[PDB]
Design a protein around this motif. Structure first.
Motif, mmCIF file in Angstrom:
data_model
loop_
_atom_site.group_PDB
_atom_site.id
_atom_site.type_symbol
_atom_site.label_atom_id
_atom_site.label_comp_id
_atom_site.label_asym_id
_atom_site.label_seq_id
_atom_site.Cartn_x
_atom_site.Cartn_y
_atom_site.Cartn_z
ATOM 1 N N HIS A 126 0.823 -1.282 0.000
ATOM 2 C CA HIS A 126 0.000 0.000 0.000
ATOM 3 C C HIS A 126 0.833 1.297 0.000
ATOM 4 C CE1 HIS A 126 -3.901 2.075 1.199
ATOM 5 N NE2 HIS A 126 -3.076 2.885 1.824
ATOM 6 N N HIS A 185 1.499 4.563 -2.680
ATOM 7 C CA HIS A 185 1.594 6.010 -2.516
ATOM 8 C C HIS A 185 3.011 6.499 -2.912
ATOM 9 C CE1 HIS A 185 -2.415 6.232 -0.954
ATOM 10 N NE2 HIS A 185 -2.115 5.774 0.243
ATOM 11 N N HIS A 243 -6.121 6.414 -3.691
ATOM 12 C CA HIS A 243 -6.880 5.319 -3.085
ATOM 13 C C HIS A 243 -7.933 4.741 -4.054
ATOM 14 C CE1 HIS A 243 -5.854 6.570 1.336
ATOM 15 N NE2 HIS A 243 -5.137 5.522 0.993
HETATM 16 ZN ZN LIG Z 1 -3.200 4.957 1.799
#
Ligand SMILES: [Zn+2]
Ligand SMILES: CC(=O)N[C@@H]1[C@@H](O)[C@H](O)[C@@H](CO)O[C@H]1NC(=S)NCCN([C@H](C(=O)O)C(C)C)S(=O)(=O)c1ccc(-c2ccccc2)cc1
Ligand SMILES: [Ca+2]
Ligand SMILES: [Ca+2]
Ligand SMILES: [Ca+2]
Ligand SMILES: [Zn+2]
Length: 157
Positions: A112, A116, A122
């Motif tokens: 995750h 980013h 998202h």
């Molecule tokens: Zn996040």
């Protein structure tokens, strides 16, 4: 903004006492792999000099104006593509990091954050690794959802 190169370096600044070092290395290496497997990005761990992506475990305030918050809440965070602090992925050392379930899973969190770090936002799919909520999923059957793949390929593919 996205990385303007496909050879991207990373460094583990420090290690969490929660896990064996070997396991931290392996979760972080595998989480880069998830992303390099569906893009032309190549990730290389370096052990000296300045990396594009600095991997840090830290608690509370740690020098970037986004203090962590103790156990729970914020697990981690990462900065978008950029020089200096950009790309850097930080993990809140007040969590209990594990290889599997039974605390917070480093591997899953790392995939995750790396998302980013690469410039992803998202996903509204609860199957997406970029979904904004952490939950343990079966690592054995782990795979990026189609939302993740199109997102990352719109950036790099
Ligand atoms: Zn996040
Ligand atoms: C509409 C809106 O403002 N939503 C924002 C997003 O725009 C934005 O991408 C992001 C900026 O912080 O935050 C959204 N809102 C929330 S609630 N973000 C979750 C907070 N975490 C962040 C993060 O997403 O990395 C981090 C930036 C502080 S988190 O610590 O709670 C976090 C959440 C889920 C995971 C996770 C782990 C494994 C698998 C899937 C998710 C890891 C960390
Ligand atoms: Ca926390
Ligand atoms: Ca950086
Ligand atoms: Ca810890
Ligand atoms: Zn930070």
């Amino acid at each position: 903004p996205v990385w303007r190169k496909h050879y991207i370096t990373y460094r583990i600044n420090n290690y969490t006492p929660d896990m064996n070092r070997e396991d931290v290395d392996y979760a972080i290496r595998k989480a880069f792999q998830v992303w390099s497997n569906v893009t032309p990005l190549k990730f290389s761990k370096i052990n000296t000099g300045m990396a594009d992506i600095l991997v840090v475990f830290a608690r509370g305030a740690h020098g970037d104006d986004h203090a962590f918050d103790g156990k729970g809440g914020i697990l981690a965070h990462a900065f978008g593509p950029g020089s200096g602090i950009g790309g850097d992925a930080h993990f809140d050392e007040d969590e209990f990091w594990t290889t599997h379930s039974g605390g917070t899973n480093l591997f899953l969190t790392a995939v995750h954050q790396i998302g980013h770090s690469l410039g992803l936002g998202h996903s509204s799919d609860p199957k997406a690794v970029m979904f904004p909520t952490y939950k343990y999923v079966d690592i054995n059957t782990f795979r990026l959802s189609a939302d993740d793949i199109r997102g990352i390929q719109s950036l790099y593919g």
